[PDB]
Amino acid sequence: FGIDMNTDYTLEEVGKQFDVTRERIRQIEAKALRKLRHPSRSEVLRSFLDD
DNA sequence: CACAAATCCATTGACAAAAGAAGGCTAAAAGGGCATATCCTCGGCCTTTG
Numbered sequence: 001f002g003i004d005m006n007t008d009y010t011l012e013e014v015g016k017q018f019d020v021t022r023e024r025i026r027q028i029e030a031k032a033l034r035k036l037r038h039p040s041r042s043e044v045l046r047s048f049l050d051d
Numbered sequence: 052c053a054c055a056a057a058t059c060c061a062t063t064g065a066c067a068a069a070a071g072a073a074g075g076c077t078a079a080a081a082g083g084g085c086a087t088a089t090c091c092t093c094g095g096c097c098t099t100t101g
Contacts, residue, residue, distance in 0.1 A: 024061045031059095 002008045015025035036042050 019061090021062060023063085027060085 011022035011025050014020075015022045018025060018028075020028075036045070039046070
């Protein structure tokens with residue numbers, strides 16, 4: 001994502017700095033998103049949702 | 052404190068899609084040519100008319 005930097009880096013350019021061919025980098029993004037998906041870790045972020 | 056099964060880590064292959072990138076096609080927007088000559092009021096202004 002683009003937090004605290006002017007991008008928006010993409011998977012190949014990300015995995016360059018981690019030496020992954022973008023597949024493990026996809027997996028790592030997915031794992032972090034799943035971890036933050038948990039309640040008791042994202043109740044505030046839930047409140048930020050508007051609906 | 053010694054040996055094998057359980058499981059986070061990283062690549063391969065295949066590949067579906069998103070992103071452009073062009074090529075083509077219209078419709079839309081711009082440009083060009085046209086060849087008889089020339090309303091109503093008001094008021095000066097002058098022809099005619101008596």
